[PDB]
Amino acid sequence: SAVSKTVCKATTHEIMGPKKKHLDYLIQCTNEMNVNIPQLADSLFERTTNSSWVVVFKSLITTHHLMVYGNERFIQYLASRNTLFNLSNFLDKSGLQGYDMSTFIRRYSRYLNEKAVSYRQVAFDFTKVKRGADGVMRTMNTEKLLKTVPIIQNQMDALLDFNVNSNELTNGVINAAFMLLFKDAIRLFAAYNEGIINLLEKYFDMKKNQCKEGLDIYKKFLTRMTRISEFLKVAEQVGIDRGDIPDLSQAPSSLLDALEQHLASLEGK
């Protein structure tokens, strides 16, 4: 009940993101093994049944914050559910602000759903695993890599589909969501990029059908890069510390012709 009470405090009608003090409490909750994760999640789900965009959006932000900063047993539990958020028809018509925010609530809930689905499918969180030449994405074997990168790609699509303009970030609730989306985006991009580095190191030794898969992955990566650039430009326009924006220039983006020529040779007599 203390947990439920704090979920309520994190999700009041006040037009601002959940307060740090309540988020910090709920993080600590996830770290105590005696805490019942399903009951904490149920409280969050219940708030998403509220008619107010403010309450619903704040419950989603709280859930996202806990996925990012909480014990891994939290996202593990969300990933175990058959269904997560069901907000595809959400609409708060109480006012123009409610209309505006309803669209973003639908898109944000879809992203969190996909974040849980990604975790269910690969049994780790792309945004939090070890990086580098010795990290998870860089060391992954061929079969697993070909399976995994499309999952990253699907998660990134759902994130980018939030599709907000800088001039739409006009209240503290949506701004709070955006800051967490920004953090996930740069971390998810690093995983995507490492997956592609790995793919390119292996591509010219793969089987014909593996190369077809790899080439599809690469073409899709190139178009997502363009979208990620657009998303970072929104972050730049709104004022985010430029030192926090990653450099996309080092993504290995000039290999299309080589990949195609190699596959073409495999498809010849």
Author numbering: 20 to 288
Sentences from the paper on this structure:
In both molecules the positions of the first ten helices are identical. The CALMANTH structures presented here in conjunction with the previously published structure (Ford et al., 2001) suggested that residues 265–289 of CALM are not integral to the ANTH domain but are flexible and associate only weakly with the domain's core residues (19–264). Inspection of the CALMANTH surface showed that the elongated patch on which the ordered short helix 11 and preceding ten residues of CALM sat was hydrophobic in nature and of the correct dimensions to bind an α helix and was thus a good candidate for the interaction site for the hydrophobic SNARE motif of a VAMP. In order for a small R-SNARE VAMP to bind to CALMANTH, helix 11 of the ANTH domain must be displaced. This dissociation will be facilitated by the fact that helix11 is only poorly associated with the rest of the ANTH domain (helices 1–10) and may be further modulated by the C-terminal tail of CALM that follows helix11 binding to the clathrin terminal domains that are displayed on the underside of the polymeric clathrin lattice (Morgan et al., 2000).
Here, we show that the R-SNAREs VAMP8, VAMP3, and VAMP2, which cycle between the plasma membrane and endosomes, bind directly to the ubiquitously expressed, PtdIns4,5P2-binding, endocytic clathrin adaptor CALM/PICALM. In this study, we provide structural, biochemical and in vivo data to show that the internalization of VAMP8, and consequently that of the highly related small R-SNAREs, VAMP3 and VAMP2, is mediated by specific, direct interactions between the N-terminal halves of their SNARE motifs and the ANTH (AP180 N-terminal Homology) domain of the endocytic clathrin adaptor CALM. Thus, CALM:R-SNARE interactions ensure that R-SNAREs, required for the fusion of endocytic clathrin-coated vesicles with endosomes and also for subsequent postendosomal trafficking, are sorted into endocytic vesicles.
